[PDB]
Amino acid sequence: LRPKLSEEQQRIIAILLDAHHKTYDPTYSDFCQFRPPVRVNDGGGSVTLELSQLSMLPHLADLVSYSIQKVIGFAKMIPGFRDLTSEDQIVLLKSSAIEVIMLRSNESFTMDDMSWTCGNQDYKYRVSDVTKAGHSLELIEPLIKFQVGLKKLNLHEEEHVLLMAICIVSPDRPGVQDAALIEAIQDRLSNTLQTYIRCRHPPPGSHLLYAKMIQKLADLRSLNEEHSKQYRCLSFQPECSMKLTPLVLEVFG
Ligand SMILES: C=C1/C(=C\C=C2/CCC[C@]3(C)[C@@H]([C@H](C)/C=C/C=C/C(O)(CC)CC)CC[C@@H]23)C[C@@H](O)C[C@@H]1O
Numbered sequence: 692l693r694p695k696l697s698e699e700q701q702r703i704i705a706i707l708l709d710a711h712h713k714t715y716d717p718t719y720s721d722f723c724q725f726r727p728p729v730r731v732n733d734g735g736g737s738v739t740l741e742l743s744q745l746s747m748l749p750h751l752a753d754l755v756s757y758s759i760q761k762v763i764g765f766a767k768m769i770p771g772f773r774d775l776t777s778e779d780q781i782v783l784l785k786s787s788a789i790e791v792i793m794l795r796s797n798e799s800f801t802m803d804d805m806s807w808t809c810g811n812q813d814y815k816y817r818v819s820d821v822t823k824a825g826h827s828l829e830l831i832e833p834l835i836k837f838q839v840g841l842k843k844l845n846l847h848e849e850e851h852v853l854l855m856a857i858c859i860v861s862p863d864r865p866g867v868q869d870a871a872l873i874e875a876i877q878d879r880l881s882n883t884l885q886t887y888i889r890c891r892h893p894p895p896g897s898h899l900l901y902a903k904m905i906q907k908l909a910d911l912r913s914l915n916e917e918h919s920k921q922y923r924c925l926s927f928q929p930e931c932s933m934k935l936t937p938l939v940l941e942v943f944g
Pocket of ligand 1: 797798
C-alpha cells in the first residue's frame, strides 16, 4: 500500500522547506564577515605545529557558531518543537548541534574534489584545513566518508530537511525530561518521511532509502562522540578559548 500524504503531512513538509530556505543561504554571502581563513605551511600535518598555530580555528569557529545560530532558528520552526519545555529544547539543540551542522553541510559538499565549496577559493574547505583547525584524521576521514555516502543517496530537499528535523528531535538524548512528547513529535516527522518516500520517491531504490537514512543518523552519533573527544583535547591548548566564540564554548564546553 502507498497511502497519500495527508493534508497535515504536506503542511509539515512545506513548513520545513520554508524554514531551511530562511536559515540556509546557498550563496554563502555572509562568510566574508567571519574572521579570515589563514592557511600556513603544514605539508607534514604536524600535530605540534597545528596545535601551536591553529590558523584555521578562528575562521571555522565563526562558521560553526554562525551555523549553530541558524540551526536554532531552524529548530524553532519544527512543528511541535515549541511545545516542549525550554529546558528540553536547549538539551536537544546542544546535543544535536554538531550533527545538524555535518548534515546541512552536505549541501556545500562536492564529490568533484571531496571538499566543501562555499563560493570562491577562500571558502573551499579540504581535509587539510580541518587539521589546521586542531582536529585529527580520526574524525576527518569518517566525516568525509559520511559526506560521500549521504551525497550518493541523492535525497530530495524534502527528505533532507526532514532528516535534520528528525535528528534534532531525538527522545534518546542524555538529559531529556519529557521523552514521550519528543518521541511523539519525532514519530510524526518519521511517518511523514516514510510516507513521502513511498509516495514521491521514484526507483531505483524506492524502498530501502528510509533504512539507509536512519542508518546515517546512527553514523552521526559516532561522529558526535569523536568530535567531543577532540574538542576536549583542543580546549587544553592555552589561549584556545579566545579563538572560539561564547556560543561554541557553551554548546561544546
Ligand atoms: C558549517 C557549514 C559548512 C561546512 C562544514 C564543514 C567544512 C569545514 C569543517 C567542518 C566545520 C567539520 C569539522 C570537523 C568541525 C569543526 C569544528 C570545530 C570546532 O571543534 C568547534 C565545534 C572548533 C572551532 C564539520 C562540518 C565541516 C558550510 C555550509 O554548508 C553551511 C554549514 O552549516
